Amino acid sequence: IVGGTASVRGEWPWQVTLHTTSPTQRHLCGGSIIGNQWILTAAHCFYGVESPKILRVYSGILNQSEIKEDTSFFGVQEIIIHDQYKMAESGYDIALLKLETTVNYTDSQRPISLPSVIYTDCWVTGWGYRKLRDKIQNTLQKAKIPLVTNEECQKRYRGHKITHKMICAGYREGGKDACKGDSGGPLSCKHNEVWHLVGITSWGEGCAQRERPGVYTNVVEYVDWILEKTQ
Ligand SMILES: NC[C@H]1CC[C@H](C(=O)N[C@@H](Cc2ccccc2)C(=O)Nc2ccc(-c3nnn[nH]3)cc2)CC1
């Protein structure tokens, strides 16, 4: 996250860190708890993941440095990528992880509601870079970002097809954005004091550049897909 601040424990309890363990253990992508057995993330995260056997889902993490050899994690039973997905920039950038067992919800691990509205209180969160050439951050970062219209977003990405299945967010002057390692995490919007998972962090041109908003999977356009897959 560029131009963000440190989160505190329990601030974003639906935020997970998805680790790969091949050839070494490291953060791969963010994700969001949407059900006791269900993580919503980006399809692109799984490019060259050989199978779910190498994945570990960590919930209730603030600092990456908390994760040791005895730290509990969830195994991944199944990766469900949208059948029309080919590439992040071409949309359908959405995936479910079915966990091997149920998350018992606590102060530190809680589900986020799907959307059913003008969202004015939207936040992007993750352990990603603070600038284009950087490293994964120890402490989960947060930044408040304004949504932009799909009409404005298309004008900034004339090499790409921006559809109603995408939502864009960013400042005209730049300064705050998702960056490398934030993908798959949530764009969380608070509406009537309830948090909604409005976006999944997907792609963009660089990080926090002027007139280059972040592009997110528009979760409300996939609610029927999610409900079909989650039963
Ligand atoms: N301004 C809009 C932003 C929107 C999110 C974008 C993003 O995050 N894309 C992923 C793609 C990706 C995900 C997973 C695997 C390969 C590639 C990505 O780049 N991840 C990534 C990179 C680097 C490390 C890494 N680990 N250690 N050092 N670097 C770890 C994950 C950046 C643009």
Numbering used by the authors: 388 to 503, 509 to 623
What does the published report state?
Activated coagulation factor XI (FXIa) is a highly attractive antithrombotic target as it contributes to the development and progression of thrombosis but is thought to play only a minor role in hemostasis so that its inhibition may allow for decoupling of antithrombotic efficacy and bleeding time prolongation. Recently, another serine protease in the coagulation cascade, factor XIa (FXIa),7 has emerged as an attractive target, because it may allow for a more selective reduction of fibrin generation: FXI is activated via FXIIa after contact activation or by thrombin in the course of the positive feedback loop for thrombin amplification, but it is not involved in the tissue factor pathway, which is key for fibrin production to cover a vessel wall leakage. Thus, this form of “selective coagulation modulation”8 by FXIa inhibition may allow for a decoupling of antithrombotic efficacy and bleeding risk and offer the opportunity for better antithrombotic protection to a much broader patient population. In this study, we describe our drug discovery efforts, resulting in the identification of asundexian (BAY 2433334, 80), a direct, potent, selective, and reversible small molecule FXIa inhibitor for oral application, which is currently being investigated in clinical Phase 3 trials.
To explore FXIa inhibitors, we synthesized tetrazole 1 (inspired by chemical matter published by Bristol Myers Squibb in 200723) which showed good potency (FXIa IC50 = 9 nM). A docking experiment of this compound in the published X-ray structure of FXIa24 indicated that the 4-aminomethyl-trans-cyclohexyl residue would occupy the S1 pocket. An X-ray cocrystal structure of tetrazole 1 in complex with human FXIa then revealed the binding mode with the key hydrogen bonds and hydrophobic contacts. We hypothesized that this orientation in the binding mode toward the prime sites might facilitate the required selectivity versus other serine proteases such as FXa and thrombin, as potent inhibitors of the latter use the more druggable pockets of their nonprime site (S1 and S2; S4).25 The cyclohexyl-bound amide carbonyl oxygen forms two hydrogen bonds with the protein backbone forming the oxyanion hole (OAH in Figure 1). The ester binding pocket (EBP) is not occupied with substituents of 1. Located in the S2′ pocket, the tetrazole moiety of 1 forms a hydrogen bond with the hydroxyl group of Tyr143 and a water-mediated interaction with the carbonyl group of His38. In the S1′ pocket, the phenyl ring of the benzyl side chain participates in a hydrophobic contact with the Cys42-Cys58 disulfide bridge.
